[PDB]
Structure formats: structure tokens, C-alpha cells
Write a protein that holds these residues in place. Sequence first.
Motif, short mmCIF file in Angstrom:
data_model
loop_
_atom_site.label_atom_id
_atom_site.label_comp_id
_atom_site.label_asym_id
_atom_site.label_seq_id
_atom_site.Cartn_x
_atom_site.Cartn_y
_atom_site.Cartn_z
N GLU A 118 1.02 3.18 5.21
CA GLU A 118 1.95 3.17 6.35
C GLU A 118 2.31 1.74 6.77
O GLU A 118 3.46 1.46 7.08
N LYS A 119 1.32 0.85 6.76
CA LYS A 119 1.51 -0.54 7.15
C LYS A 119 2.41 -1.30 6.17
O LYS A 119 3.34 -1.99 6.58
N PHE A 120 2.11 -1.18 4.88
CA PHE A 120 2.81 -1.96 3.87
C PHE A 120 4.23 -1.47 3.56
O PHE A 120 5.11 -2.28 3.28
N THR A 121 4.44 -0.15 3.62
CA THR A 121 5.80 0.40 3.51
C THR A 121 6.65 0.00 4.72
O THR A 121 7.85 -0.25 4.57
N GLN A 122 6.04 -0.06 5.90
CA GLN A 122 6.74 -0.50 7.11
C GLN A 122 7.14 -1.97 7.02
O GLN A 122 8.18 -2.36 7.54
N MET A 123 6.32 -2.78 6.37
CA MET A 123 6.62 -4.20 6.20
C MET A 123 7.66 -4.44 5.11
O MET A 123 8.21 -5.54 5.01
N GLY A 124 7.94 -3.41 4.31
CA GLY A 124 8.98 -3.47 3.29
C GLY A 124 8.53 -4.11 2.00
O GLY A 124 9.36 -4.51 1.17
N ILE A 125 7.22 -4.21 1.80
CA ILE A 125 6.66 -4.81 0.60
C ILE A 125 6.83 -3.83 -0.57
O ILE A 125 6.85 -2.62 -0.37
N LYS A 126 7.00 -4.37 -1.78
CA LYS A 126 7.13 -3.53 -2.96
C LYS A 126 5.79 -2.86 -3.22
O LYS A 126 4.76 -3.54 -3.28
N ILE A 127 5.81 -1.54 -3.37
CA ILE A 127 4.59 -0.74 -3.52
C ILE A 127 4.66 0.11 -4.79
O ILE A 127 5.70 0.69 -5.09
#
Length: 340
Positions: A25-34
Amino acid sequence: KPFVPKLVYFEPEALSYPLGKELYEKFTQMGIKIRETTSHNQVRGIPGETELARYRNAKSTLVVGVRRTLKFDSCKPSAEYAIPLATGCMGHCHYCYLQTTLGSKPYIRVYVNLDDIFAQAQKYINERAPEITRFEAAATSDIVGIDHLTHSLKKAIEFIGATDYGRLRFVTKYEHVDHLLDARHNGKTRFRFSINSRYVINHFEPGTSSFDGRLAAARKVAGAGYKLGFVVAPIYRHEGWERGYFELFQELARQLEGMDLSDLTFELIQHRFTKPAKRVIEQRYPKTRLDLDETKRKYKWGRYGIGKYVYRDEEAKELEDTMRRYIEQFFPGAYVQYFT
Ligand SMILES: C[C@@]1(Cc2cn([C@H]3C[C@H](O)[C@@H](CO)O3)c(=O)[nH]c2=O)CN([C@H]2C[C@H](O)[C@@H](CO)O2)C(=O)NC1=O
Ligand SMILES: C[Se@@+](CC[C@H](N)C(=O)O)C[C@H]1O[C@@H](n2cnc3c(N)ncnc32)[C@H](O)[C@@H]1O
Ligand code: SF4
């Protein structure tokens, strides 16, 4: 500063855990490539064309996974066991021993199943109780450096505080410790910081916090009631090391003025490398002035692992005696836990 990855892999199984759910939830919200990876032990598609490129890029990659090996390694002389919360580091220390321990896995790994890990640690404490069982949280990583993203160590600190016979310790080169200051450590955490001569920090420790950054962070945690300690490592015989390490303890004591240092500990580790490491470091860090001349060393043959080069017994004793004299000069009452 603080560390935020530029690429995050997730195990599918990780998402079945609270912390795995939270980080996604945190990293998708920050827009980082996942991305997905079928196992954190084998992650594919890290960018780069040379090995060196993929090394640089791995050290900016986080991998959220599950600890499936619940059996803990022994971690002497620091602790009976290494509690596995993380593996890898964002630092670029030229001498780093993870270049051989995690040579093939240079990315940052964090494990999400803390309930399994804390449970198993509780089993280990029960096996030895009422003897004290220590756990090292930073044997294969800079757990503190990355903890602001996960708060896994904060939880580990509070679990251990709740136990009778369990103890926690860890060492860091990072100053990002504010989120740990209000933790219920209950006196059972030794919060340590790696320090060194100016020669070693400036030349060999990029991607870490400056000496002053570590000392500010040291004052804060001692101020929060943590037990404080330092790790003088790697002790390295550069030009003017005697004076170089004298000014370390001089400046250290100066920056710890007016503080309760009755329960201060020191740990001393002389520089060491393996035969593979010499050729691994030469390409991973081309222009380093780190001397890896085996003719200046003695080879200490291995027992279960591979052997390594250390300074000759006589030069090793010169280091130990010098550090002991300095610690005894500037920090009377402090205890040197070991020299290695
Ligand atoms: C932070 C450490 C953690 C540690 C690591 N290790 C292992 C795990 C790691 O992969 C390996 C590096 O050779 O060293 C160990 O056996 N004992 C330890 O106490 C670092 N070390 C290093 C020094 C040396 O490489 C090795 C044995 O002392 O551990 C140590 O002695 N004190 C510590 O507190
Ligand atoms: C791998 Se470091 C993990 C903990 C944290 N990220 C930290 O840097 O403090 C463990 C310690 O051992 C030292 N050290 C690292 N490599 C070597 C080495 N090759 N020889 C001798 N010492 C080496 C480092 O300065 C650290 O004080
Ligand atoms: S910080 Fe500790 S771990 Fe990260 S690189 Fe420098 S030494 Fe290896």
C-alpha cells in the motif's frame, strides 16, 4: 537519506501478511515501480548490463518476502543467535563483508512474518533459560538504516523487552533513529554504532551517515534510555593509523560529554577479507585505495566457512593494545567486550 528504494519486488506470499499488505500500500502510493518475484532468494530482471551496474541497482532494490528458514544462525562473538529480520544494505562500504556473504544477493530483503520469527526466537530463549540469550539483528544488514520503512526492529525491540531472559543488540552506520526513540526497550537492547578513523570513513564508507550523524543519533538513543555501545570496525592499518585512531576516541569522548557512560561497551574488529573478495572488490569498486595485499596479512584457515586474511598476530596485538589504551584513557569504566 533516509533510504527509499527505486524498485520493489514482492513475493506473492508476502501479501498474506500485515506488513506485506502495508508495504504494498505504501510503495504503490509513492508511485515506485513494483514487481513480483516467485522467491526473494531468486529475483529476476534487475536493470543494468554490466555486473557492476546490477550491483549498484540491486543496492537500490527492496525485496519484501517471507522468512522460510526459521532456524537461526549462531552469531558469536556478538550474540548466541542472529535474529533474521533483514538481509542487505544501501551502503557502499568498499571493505564490506557482505560482498562475500551476500555477493549474489546485493538487494535489500525484509521479511514480513514477524510472528513466526519472534515465536522461534522465543523458543530459543526457552531452550536456554534462565540463562540469557542474545540476538544480533544486524549481522547481515543495516537493519536500523532501513527500519523506518517497516518498523520491524522497533517491534523486535518491544518483543524482547517483554521477555525475561531475551536480549537484543544491533549496530548501524545510519542516523535515522527518531522512530525508535519511544520504543519500550525495557533496558534489553544494546544500540550500537560503527565508528572509525577519518581516513577509513571518508575513503571507504560512501552511502552511510557521517561520523557526526552517527554521534547525534548516539546521543539521542542514550538519551532514550537505550544501552549504548560502539563497534570500532574495520580496524585498518592505514598511514598514520595510531594517530588516526587516537583522534577517533578523542573526538568520540568530546561528542559524548556530560552523559552517563557507565554501561558503555566497545567491540573491536580488525579488517579481514577472503580470497574471492579481492577480485570481487576490484571490479565492484575500481578506484578504491583499500589495500588488499595478502603479503601484508596472515591467512587464517576456515573451519566450516572459508578462511580469511587478518593482520599477523603481532600486528593484531598492536591494534588491540592501542584501542584498549585509548578506550581506557578517554572512557574509564567502559568495557571492551572482545577483540577479533
Ligand atoms: C556486527 C557483527 C556481527 C556478526 C557477524 N557474524 C558473521 C555473519 C556474517 O555473515 C559473517 C561475516 O564474515 O560474520 C558472526 O559470526 N558474528 C557476529 O557477531 C560483526 N562481526 C563480524 C566480524 C567477523 O566478520 C565475524 C566474526 O567475528 O563477525 C563481529 O564479530 N561482531 C558483530 O557484532
Ligand atoms: C557488515 Se556490518 C553490518 C552492520 C551495519 N550495517 C554496520 O555497518 O555497522 C558489521 C560490522 O563489521 C564491519 N565490517 C564490514 N566488513 C568488514 C570486513 N571486511 N572486515 C572487518 N570488519 C568489517 C563494519 O564496519 C561493521 O562495523
Ligand atoms: S554499512 Fe555495514 S553493511 Fe552496509 S555496507 Fe557499510 S558495512 Fe556493509
